[PDB]
């Protein structure tokens, strides 16, 4: 994996991306 201070997730590196989509359920949040 790669660490960063602000992003967590998945990143595709390539060429010609013209559309990105995803579906998720709104989470329950509490204090960190």
């Amino acid at each position: 994996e790669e660490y960063s201070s602000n992003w967590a997730g998945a990143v595709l590196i390539g060429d010609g991306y013209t559309k990105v989509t995803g579906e998720f359920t709104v989470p329950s949040v509490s204090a960190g």
Binding site: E1, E2, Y3, S4, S5, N6, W7, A8, G9, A10, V11, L12, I13, G14, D15, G16, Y17, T18, K19, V20, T21, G22, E23, F24, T25, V26, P27, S28, V29, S30, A31, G32
Partner: protein, 171 residues
């Protein structure tokens, strides 16, 4: 104290520095209350909120960004649970050109104030039907670079991907 996090999909911003076309939802917590909102942004311009859509805990959201050229496209947020759908079209007049080299599904600790906003414990966020289109063909996150947040000597997330999904869990 208020804690927040955001989840969004977007094009560019990692290896392409001139722009980011992105859309998503912010979730915040503060003293027994929560606040949710949907927004769009074509970085370096500011993020703007979609005021005509209600987001609630547990709702199923589908987010999509599409580029019709390196300087035009759209951002769409659909609340599948309520049937609401909003789209912002960027006909041009943008402040940055896309390279179209990165496609991503991200949970972010965004900047607010002097630094990053206190990071909320969101449990876990799973993006399903995670697909990117390149050259007319669709690809999933299988070969994607996995990223996690690490601040002040603390790992705050654990990410796992499958052939069609991305799961980010708070640590």
């Amino acid at each position: 104290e208020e804690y927040c996090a955001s989840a969004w999909v977007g094009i560019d911003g990692d290896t392409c520095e001139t722009a980011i076309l992105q859309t998503g939802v912010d979730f915040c917590y503060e003293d027994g209350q929560t606040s949710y909102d949907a927004w769009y942004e074509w970085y370096p311009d500011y993020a703007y909120d979609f005021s005509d859509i209600t987001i609630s805990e547990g709702d199923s959201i589908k987010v999509t960004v599409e580029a019709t050229s390196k300087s035009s496209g759209s951002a769409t947020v659909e609340n599948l649970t309520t049937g609401q759908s909003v789209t912002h079209t960027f006909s041009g007049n943008v402040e940055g050109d896309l390279c179209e080299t990165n496609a991503e599904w991200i949970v972010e600790d965004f900047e607010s104030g002097d630094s990053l906003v206190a990071f909320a414990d969101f449990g876990s966020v799973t993006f399903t039907n995670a697909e990117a289109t390149s050259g007319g063909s669709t690809v999933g996150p299988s070969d994607a670079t996995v990223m996690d947040i690490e601040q002040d000597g603390s790992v705050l997330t654990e990410t796992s991907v499958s052939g069609d999904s991305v799961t980010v869990t708070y640590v």
